[PDB]
């Protein structure tokens, strides 16, 4: 399938069905079976795992049996050819090991045998990840725990987990590769991760990186660099759904009604030329605006804001806002994963996430962190249930996609949805739990409207972080947990003395006991940076996995031990302490 | 303050307010809080951390708030020529990260962030130890657990209790750098910690290696380079106060009546050499002995004494017992820290525990361990209390600090407290406990005398040893513990059969059930050398984050884990297994 | 002396004077030889060697000799708190090696021993430089060729070079340390060089990374935040002093006569404000823009340009030409060194050369390669003289400090001179050799004014050039050679053909008939990037020394090899093949 916004073809994934070359007897008992075995997973993952834009994966399967090296070349043009950027090696019975192999380095690779006792199966299995791993080509291994009968086209539940966190994880790597991270601005008041580091995009996740200083707005903005037709429809749109709330600008820091009007059409043309630099805009062409009009190929961007930009210009709330956000005055769409204050490794933290579920991402600064005997000598009230061990405040300055706002609703629970799969209540509700704020002057001298929502309680979330460590090179945290609601009483009080004119997100991780999940405390004392990306559920053990792909070790997680999915490489570096072996590996491989 | 041994100044602290750089409503707002803050960590620390001669340690604040890089530039210019050594960085608010980051590599430095809602204060915070962590500068961060309200000046206990740990690691870190490192004769008998390596005094602690033949003792003996107003006042003084015990020495073993004389004589006048070799001595000069009136400006020393100098002269035993001890002929005073048989690693180890104390530090050998079964039945008594699981006894080869005794009295209880604060009860007890036994002469054939006591039990104590492993470096081990009482006739039957003549210490290491710490064997089957230093109090946590601070992995220790302070960089290279991100952390960093 | 224009002051150079420690006899003899020698070297110095605002350098001598330790640790101790930055022994005896070395790693470090027979002077510079080798303390070894007799005060011609070279290329390196580059703009037309490595700045320069969005510009002359009065005062000496070449732009591409009177302003406007951010500007503070008024500390500095800005606003070329220059409506000054579309290697190239010289410095684009028989074919003239082998023709875009016109002279000569030694005549000639033309608009959109001049020929030159390179990192490649002069009829033709509008120096390297340099062609194909920054005279010996402080190798020079002056230590790592070396001594250093 084409990319709808991207230069070329969605990823693919090639399935392999290996077999035993014996023919006369053997190859011919078995050559249904095994054929049978990939259109199976080829089943499984169309029906499981889909592309950003709601279209099923597309799956390639070779088109012989793959017995010899013959074979597996011929598999390796086809793949080639065909744009695969994932591989699935499925077998019933015993293939001759590197023979066989799939040795492209530059891909995803998981191995399935069947669990039969008639061939060796997972003989094969353990045979072909021996030589991945002497190799140095990581592949994942796959086993399910019983035995099934020969020719069971039925996949047990335990294979089919790893299948499909797999296959996404797989997908989720090989999205990225050929894209671009375009950086709008430069550093953002020093914060470290708005320092673009090359070699990371470049080496670890096949990108490139692109530059535009912000005084291009300023040149289309003036010049009218941008859909005029679009422009009048959405300036009409936020009038009619975004909903203006209190100014908390004091005397000597409140603008103006005009101001306040043209701080919202600067807004509003903002975000359509940030659209336009990421993915282009063909309605530019017509308009003699040719080299514009083709974009930077960007699956990735972000904006410096301040400080320059925002002492002087509307700040990026709305453009951050809205570019995040699955829907907007053309209806129901996929996100543009946009960073706040350029901060390129959140914007790559939100990427992970964004690609792995097709969700909306909540970009935040890691606030404050709650104390039950805070809370209750501020307010006199003693937090409950979930949150009775503290919480914490997550809160962007300012920004943050609707769908933050947890109306979004499946059976009865809120959630985050992907695009593809909203009603228009859920967007409506949205839009009415959100308030537009004006700017606080104080720090944003150029006006513009922060979002202000509250989001509701009881969702499963994960929030991340990617870090880059001198002596290291990227490194990743992760805490599983759930919002919380407070009673209202409870946060106007927490809030009115933060910032409520920012998005809130009361947030408690899920405790083990252990490493820095021993109390609410240690994780946010552990937290690398002041940002993290929200996503709606637990994908930690698929951030885990996608992550052990990019080689990027894990320096903080709170997954359960036997969810934890990585290349049957990494045990050749230590069963005891996965930790250790997470480093050892990643540096090795 | 002049530091009144060596060169130069002590170290001074510097505390860096740092404050968000908007004008016009942001910064004015809080010019006053972030100085006040700056202030408040000022007087904490006058009030809590000392110079090794009682002298509160100096801060200097810097002269305006940092909200950028020109203020920041003026802090690092005022702080060079202050003499500053150590750095805090305080803040109620956000900040500029990189720009206003305290950019020398070469000086200890730790973060405070308010915890306040107000101001992004804990944003800073993270934000900033983001940048060290990405530009390879090692930092500490201090985020207090409740959350305060703006304006509040105190400084909550767990904020207090980093910050101390944190100065006094920091100031004993800064203390080393410059000094020397006195060997006095060659390797001792084969010990490998007397070898010495330069590469790590220079390189770790900064450091200088100065070297002195034994054969400097002879000359300054047979010359009288030495004070000899001060040599005769000595003598009046051990004669006076130093008894001595029972010679049991085996009939043709005894020395004469003369040569016990002339042994004590020149007992005194090593003492006098050894210390004017380390600090100098103006009176050389005056007496005509100008280079020799110098000194080595050193603030550590050893001596090797067997076999060479031991073969033919009196032993050094009185030497280095009195010279380790924090009182003498001239009164209370500092110890000078001084390492037996020229094991420089011990002497390292000596002087961490003392920089970190400014208490007299026991120099011993790890002698015996005494399994419950093993003292029952050479003795036929049970082991009770803290020393049920067993002991270890650690004694010297004849020397140790008077202060071992445990004579010294604080609130009822046995302690080693710094030389200030010693009372002259304290004093005429330690001697009082103390017997100086004629050396055993078929080890010690020049004769001398040793040091014996019975350190008294109940005390809270830690042993250290830093070793020097071919593939790692240096590498830190230890434990916390207690010495203990046995019942006389129990002490005197162990006493008897070991080596009554030198200095007892019954010692119970506190266990954790895993590691090196399951039972007390272990903890001595795993000591990586037959030497350790002693140390009064539970100083585990202050050695680890002094260790973190130098990148000395710790091998093995029994610090509670919630008491592991160490810079914000190591959990980066892990949370779950804080071991192995140690040594990560000390090796790429 | 303190900084001008940046925080603290000067570098100082640190004097050493080290002696025999024996007395009753040695010393005392040597005692006043030493120190004579020492007081001898400042002399020197302090009239050989200047300050970027023509202040002699100033020299701090021990407070004594140095003959041990003690005396070494009190000379580390005054040069720390004297602001020391550049360390230099001297001694006519033989000294204590170690006891009496400078171990302070972070300061460049030379050794001259008096060649005398009397005492062993080459002895200990041979034997300290051991120590300094054993140690990792790169240090220079400066001895005399010819025996000078005991008592001597002259110093050797050979001697004199190597102690002006060492002190030269210390002074600049320790010019840098805490100093800021600062990005305006981000990348520019992907260039490499514009993009940022802050490893490279923090870990081999010293230097701090500060950052600005091009948009401030915007703010900056939207509000009027600069200096108005000197505005208006600039404005006048423009069109006074700044005369206007003709039209290159075609019919539909000339600006109008409203528009170019604007982008007259705007240059100006551009000028003071990028002035104003590099060193602030108290004038700022007094209208009420504190923050801005700091400025960023800068000792050099970028401008994007292309594409976002120039897309819009007048270029930068006014900005760039002006900064660059030694001289503007303030009178003479010295020059901001100020890097074209924020290429920050040409930056650091450009500061490299001015550090060492003083000297205004060109920066500009290796544009075209004339060989003989390209400049025959086209013009019909035959290569004369220097050119005779072919030429390289130098032009940046638009931009080239006025110094670049080799209108001023010495003795005759064309050069180009520090500000503080420049005449009414020479700034006049600068400006009388120049013409502004209108920027080509379909290039520069937003207009401005282009430096359109002939340097002139016979002028010794040294372009060089630092690249960072994956696997190696920074590299430096240096080319010595003349500008030479073409007849009048031939630089019009080659002239007209290219960018008339530019600013065009004519070069010729030196050839050495091996390496790069075997013929004109050779040295232009190995080039390293598009840009190069040209210094009036031959300082690659400079430069080569000044880079093996810095542990940068060079990849490429033409500098006789009896010219070639690095640490000691690089000898070490080979003699036969001084290239290899450097990168061996590079990296393991
Ligand atoms: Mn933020
Ligand atoms: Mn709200
Ligand atoms: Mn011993
Ligand atoms: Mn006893
Ligand atoms: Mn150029
Ligand atoms: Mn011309």
Same mark, same amino acid.
């Given at each position: ?22 023919? %006369? =007897?053997?190859? #011919? ?26 279209? +099923? ?34 077998? $019933? ?11 492209? $380095? ?6 399935? =045998? ?5 061939? &060796? ?13 002497? %190799? ?31 296959? %996404? ?18 550093? @953002?008041? =020093? ?13 670890? /996740? ?8 912000? @005084? ?12 005029? #037709? ?12 975004? %909903? ?57 961007? =972000? ?6 930009? !925002?002492?002087?210009? &509307? ?9 995040? @956000? ?56 003693? /937090? ?77 979330? !994960? ?19 759930? !919002?919380?609601?407070?009673? #209202? ?15 809130? *997100?009361?947030?408690? $991780?899920?405790? *083990? ?21 929200? @996503? ?13 792909? /990019?080689?990027? +070790? ?7 031990? #036997? ?27």
């Amino acid at each position: 399938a084409k990319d709808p916004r991207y230069v070329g073809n969605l990823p693919k994934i090639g399935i392999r069905p290996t077999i035993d070359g014996r023919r %006369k =007897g053997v190859r #011919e008992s078995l050559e249904e079976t095994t054929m049978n075995m990939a259109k199976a997973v080829a089943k499984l993952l169309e029906e499981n795992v889909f592309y950003y834009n709601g279209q +099923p994966v597309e799956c390639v399967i070779a088109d012989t049996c793959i017995g010899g090296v013959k074979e597996a070349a011929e598999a390796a043009e086809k793949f080639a050819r065909e744009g695969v950027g994932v591989s699935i090696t499925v077998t $019933p019975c015993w293939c001759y090991g590197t023979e066989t192999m799939d040795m492209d $380095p530059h891909i995803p690779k998981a191995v399935w =045998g069947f669990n039969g006792t008639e061939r &060796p199966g997972a003989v094969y299995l353990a045979a072909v990840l021996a030589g991945y791993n002497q %190799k140095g080509l990581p592949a994942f291994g796959i086993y399910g725990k019983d035995v099934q009968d020969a020719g069971d086209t039925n996949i047990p539940e335990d294979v089919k987990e790893k299948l499909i966190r797999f296959a %996404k994880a797989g997908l989720a790597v090989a999205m990225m590769k050929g894209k671009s991270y375009l950086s709008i601005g430069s550093v @953002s008041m =020093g914060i470290a991760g708005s320092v673009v580091q090359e070699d990371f995009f470049q080496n670890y /996740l096949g990108m490139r990186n692109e530059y535009v200083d912000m @005084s291009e707005f300023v040149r289309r903005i003036e010049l009218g660099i941008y859909d005029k #037709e679009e422009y009048e429809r959405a300036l009409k749109w936020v009038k009619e759904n975004c %909903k203006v709330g209190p100014d908390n600008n004091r005397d000597g820091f409140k603008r103006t009604e005009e101001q306040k009007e043209k701080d919202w059409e600067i807004s509003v043309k903002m975000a359509l030329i940030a659209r336009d630099l990421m993915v282009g805009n063909k309605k530019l062409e017509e308009m003699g605006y040719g080299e514009e009009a083709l974009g930077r190929n960007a699956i990735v961007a =972000g904006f410096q804001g301040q400080r320059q930009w !925002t002492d002087y210009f &509307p700040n990026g709330d709305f453009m951050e806002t809205i570019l995040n @956000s699955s829907f907007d005055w053309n209806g129901k769409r996929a996100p543009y994963i946009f960073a706040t204050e350029n901060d390129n490794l959140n914007g790559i933290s939100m990427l992970f996430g964004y690609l792995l579920t097709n969700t909306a991402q909540i970009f935040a600064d890691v606030r404050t962190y709650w104390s039950p005997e805070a809370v209750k000598r501020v307010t006199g009230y003693t /937090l409950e249930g979930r949150a009775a061990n503290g919480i914490i405040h997550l809160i962007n300055s300012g920004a943050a996609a609707l769908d933050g706002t947890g109306e979004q609703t499946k059976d009865g629970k809120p959630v985050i949805k992907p695009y593809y799969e909203l009603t228009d209540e859920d967007i409506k509700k949205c839009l009415e739990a959100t308030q537009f704020r004006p700017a606080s002057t104080e720090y944003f001298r150029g006006g513009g409207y922060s979002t202000d929502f509250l989001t509701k309680g009881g969702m499963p979330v !994960t929030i991340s972080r990617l870090n880059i460590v001198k002596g290291l090179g990227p490194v990743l945290q992760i805490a599983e947990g759930y !919002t919380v609601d407070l009673p #209202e009483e409870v946060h106007d009080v927490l809030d009115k003395r933060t910032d409520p004119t920012w998005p809130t *997100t009361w947030f408690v $991780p899920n405790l *083990t006991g252990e490493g820095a999940f021993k109390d609410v405390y240690s994780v946010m004392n552990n937290w690398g940076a002041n940002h993290c990306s929200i @996503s709606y559920g637990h994908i930690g053990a698929d951030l885990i996995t996608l992550a052990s792909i /990019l080689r990027i +070790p894990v320096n903080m997680h709170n997954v359960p031990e #036997e969810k934890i999915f990585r290349p049957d490489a990494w045990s050749m570096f230590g069963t005891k302490d996965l930790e250790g072996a997470d480093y050892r590996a990643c540096k090795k491989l």
